Structures are given as C-alpha cells and as structure tokens.
Design goal:
The structure is cut from a larger assembly and holds chains A (50 residues) and B (85 residues). Chain A has 50 residues and is mostly beta strands. Chain A contains no helices and two strands. Chain A has a two-stranded antiparallel ribbon. Chain A is elongated. Chain A starts with 28 loop residues before the first strand and ends in a 14-residue tail after the last strand. In chain B, the strands form three sheets. A three-stranded antiparallel sheet of chain B has the order 1-2-5, with no helix packed on it. A two-stranded antiparallel sheet of chain B has the order 3-4. In chain B, 0% of the residues lie in helices and 39% in strands. Chain B is mainly beta. Classes of the chains: A mainly beta (50), B mainly beta (85). Chains A and B meet through loops of A and loops of B. Chain A: This is Spike glycoprotein E1. Chain A: It comes from Eastern equine encephalitis virus (strain Florida 91-469) (EEEV). Chain A: It is a single-pass type I membrane protein.
Chain lengths: 50, 85
C-alpha cells in the first residue's frame, strides 16, 4: 500500500489486502503444472520408496 | 513333472522401523506378496495378507519374539523386549 503505477495517466495505490490466505502452504511440491501443497520430508532424508 | 528348482521369485526388502514392542513396516512390493507372521507365544496370533499395494503395516510384537516372512524371502525374527524405559 504505497506502490503507484503511473501507466496511462492515473496514479493508483493498492492494498495491502486483508485476506492473507496464501493458498500455498509452507511446504510445497511442484510438478510440471500440478502443484501440491505437500509436506515433502526434506532434502537429505527422504525414505526410500517414499 | 519333475522337482526342478525354478529360477524363482523374490520381493523387495522391507523397511524395518522400530517402535515400542511394535514393528511399523513401510512396505512396497513388486507383485502381490503373501506376508505372514507367528507370534511365538503359545498364543500364536498369526496374520496373513497378500500385499500388492504398498502399505505401512503394524505388528504388536510380544516380549519373547515374532517372525516375519516377506514373501519367499527367508523368514526374519525379532527381539522386542521393552523400549518404554
């Protein structure tokens, strides 16, 4: 809520929005286009098969 | 018909995981595998289940022991005494 964007002629300031729901979780896996908000175990640890 | 020893089957090894008198086993076969056990008490309490879908299973092991048969892979055995301190 202090960024303008003088594109056109008008100066416009937006937000910050109140609805801070990031639909992404903290931990996310990503695949090509299908995005999975998955609790991936970690680098360095993942159990075999898992 | 003769008693040939076919070159034969084998299922991928299990993932042994410890708990208190309990075997969690994340398991992941190639094909449907008949798993089964024998709680070696005079209470047998055996189990049988063909496993083709990978499955984390559980086994209440007793004090004296249990055995474990991942397919025609040889039978395992396990001491589960305490772990609850």
């Amino acid at each position: 809520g202090e960024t303008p964007a003088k594109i056109g002629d008008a100066k416009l300031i937006i937000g910050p929005l109140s609805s801070a729901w990031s639909p992404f979780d903290n931990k996310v896996v990503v695949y090509g286009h299908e995005v999975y908000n998955y609790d991936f175990p970690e680098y360095g640890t993942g159990k075999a098969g898992s | 018909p003769v008693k040939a020893k076919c070159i034969a089957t084998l299922a991928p090894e299990p993932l042994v995981e410890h708990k208190h008198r309990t075997l969690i086993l994340h398991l992941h076969p190639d094909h449907p595998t008949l798993l089964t056990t024998r709680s070696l008490g005079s209470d047998a309490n055996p189990t049988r289940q063909w496993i083709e879908r990978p499955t984390t299973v559980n086994f209440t092991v007793t004090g004296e022991g249990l055995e474990y048969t991942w397919g025609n892979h040889p039978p395992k055995r396990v001491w589960a005494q305490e772990s609850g301190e």
